[PDB]
């Protein structure tokens, strides 16, 4: 199916079973989310320049698909699913 | 046709005949661009909080379509075509 873009494309995803609302952002290369607790097993990352925790091989369910991917958690004003997850979800921009 | 999202979706557009490379950004509500001169007929806008010039009814050609829309010019690190132009161009997110 398709999503029209009149409204900001915010959907609900479950990351490791924890619900979160995210923005499907074609302007972002990576994904960062907050408000969930993925655990002690992460790689500290630095991306202003905030401090994030990188989790790899995480199960995410959104839009009827269940994938495994990488996600970063940290102080972000918006929860965003960037192109690294959009591609793993088989999403494209149509015109 | 469709655009896959492995690469940042940057395309070339002509705005009033002036070439510019823009990012098709689903994370942006509006569009702002720099490096082109659209003229003296604009509405000053404030959107950090930068100062922009809003032009309405501007002819833009991109992706094989020619539309008229609104665009803001001003100091932006990236030239972005937000949802206000993506919808006028008939673009959707497919999955």
| CATH code of the domain in which B50 resides | 2.40.70.10
**Count, residues in chain B:** 95
Spell out the residues 6+ positions from residue A64 whose beta carbon is closer than 8 angstroms to its own: none
Would the CB atoms of B83 and A28 count as touching at under 8 Å? no
**3-state SS record for B1-51:** CEEECCCCCEEEEEECCEEEEEEECCCCCCCEECCCCCCCCCEEEECCCCE
Contacts of B17 (CB under 8 A, 6+ apart): none
Asked if A60 has any chain B CB less than 8 Å from its own CB, the reply is: no
How far from the centroid of its chain's Cα atoms is residue A27's Cα? 13
Task: Indicate the SS3 state at residue B92.
Answer: strand
Render the burial of B48-71: b for 16+ CB within 10 Å, e for the rest.
eeeebbbbeebebebbeeeeebbb
| DSSP for residue B68 | E
**How far, in Å, CA of A19 to CA of A54, rounded?**
18
Domain span including residue B57: 1-95
Q: How many separate domains does chain A show?
A: 1
The pair phi, psi for residue A64, each rounded to 5°, is 85, 0
Distance from C-alpha of A20 to C-alpha of B15, rounded to nearest angstrom = 38
Asked if B95 and A89 come within 8 Å (Cβ–Cβ), the reply is yes
From residue A64, alpha-carbon distances to A1, A61, A89, B3 in Å are: 11, 7, 10, 21
B76 in contact with A, Cβ within 8 Å: no
> Is residue A3 less than 8 Å (CB to CB) from chain B?
yes
The alpha carbons of chain B give a radius of gyration, in whole angstroms, of: 13
Chain B residue numbers touching A95 (CB-CB < 8 A):
1-3, 63, 65, 89-92
C-alpha gyration radius of chain A: 13
Chain A nearest CA to B34, separation (Å): 17
What technique was this entry resolved by?
X-ray
Mutate to test the interface with B, among A26, A66, A78 (most CBs of B within 10 A): A26
Active site residue B25: yes
């Amino acid at each position: 199916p398709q999503f029209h873009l009149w409204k900001r494309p915010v959907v609900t995803a479950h990351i490791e079973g924890q619900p979160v609302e995210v923005l499907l952002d074609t302007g972002a290369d990576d994904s960062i989310v907050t408000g969930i607790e993925l655990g002690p097993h992460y790689t500290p990352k630095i991306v202003g320049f905030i401090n994030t925790k990188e989790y790899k091989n995480v199960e995410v369910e959104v839009l009827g698909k269940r994938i495994k991917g990488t996600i970063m958690t940290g102080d972000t004003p918006i929860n965003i699913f960037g192109r690294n997850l959009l591609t793993a979800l088989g999403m494209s921009l149509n015109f």
